[PDB]
């Protein structure tokens, strides 16, 4: 009969099919916060990563829309509408803040410290950068400066290990290359740096079975980004 670990993992795959991502987070939190020293299997960490991605991804979408609407109402002169939107935007921002906190907390306490190979090292590090990036998208004032900084640190750290440790074809190295180059673009606001990081990592794996699908996909996201970027 399946263990508790085996079971929560299974419950999580059902929640993924059913598209109930909050539940998928909770089950994947259970698998993590029942361990001690053990690090997660590749399958498990891929699942946690998918779980959180979809949960945040729905708030980020909702956020962009609501942002576009107050800005359009700021210039229509529409004062009462702007305030209601404002108060609604905040409610979406509390959720965003609380979600990022979930995964940062577990990454700083468990996942980062017990990552042995250069595989796992680069992964939770990418993850940390990712979730500070989402903070940066919406925070203002000091909170903004902090998060964008934590974004660079984590992304830069994982970079070393990636370049010294992993094949330039590897899915993880390429994902990091993509996300990193997006950080420079959207938050660091510098086109050329986004373009250099992205141009090089494409070029490097242009040189080098289990990985074919994933890699070629992230390789395609790179080109899709460079071409869009270059053209604007």
């Amino acid at each position: 009969a399946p263990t508790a670990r085996e079971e929560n993992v299974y419950m999580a795959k059902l929640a993924e099919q059913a598209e109930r991502y909050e539940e998928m987070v909770e089950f994947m939190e259970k698998v993590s916060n029942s361990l001690g020293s053990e690090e997660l299997t590749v399958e498990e960490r891929n699942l946690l990563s998918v779980a959180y991605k979809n949960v945040i991804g729905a708030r980020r979408a909702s956020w962009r829309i609501i942002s576009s609407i107050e800005q359009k109402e700021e210039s229509r002169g529409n004062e009462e509408h702007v305030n209601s939107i404002r108060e609604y935007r905040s409610k979406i921002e509390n959720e965003l803040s609380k979600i990022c906190d979930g995964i940062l907390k577990l990454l700083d306490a468990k996942l980062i410290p017990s990552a042995a190979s250069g595989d796992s090292k680069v992964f939770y590090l990418k993850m940390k950068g990712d979730y500070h990036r989402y903070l940066a998208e919406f925070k203002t004032g000091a909170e903004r400066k902090e998060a964008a900084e934590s974004t660079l640190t984590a992304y830069k750290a994982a970079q070393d290990i990636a370049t010294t440790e992993l094949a330039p074809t590897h899915p993880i190295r390429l994902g990091l290359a993509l996300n990193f180059s997006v950080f420079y673009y959207e938050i660091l606001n510098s086109p050329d740096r986004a373009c250099n990081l992205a141009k090089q990592a494409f070029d490097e794996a242009i040189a080098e079975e289990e990985s074919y699908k994933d890699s070629t996909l992230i390789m395609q996201l790179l080109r899709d980004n460079l071409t869009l970027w270059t053209s604007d």
Binding site: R64, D130, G175, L178, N179, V182, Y185, E186, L217, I218, L221, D224, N225, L228, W229
Partner: peptide, 5 residues
């Protein structure tokens, strides 16, 4: 916005 993975 821009593609991430």
């Amino acid at each position: 916005q821009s593609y991430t993975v």
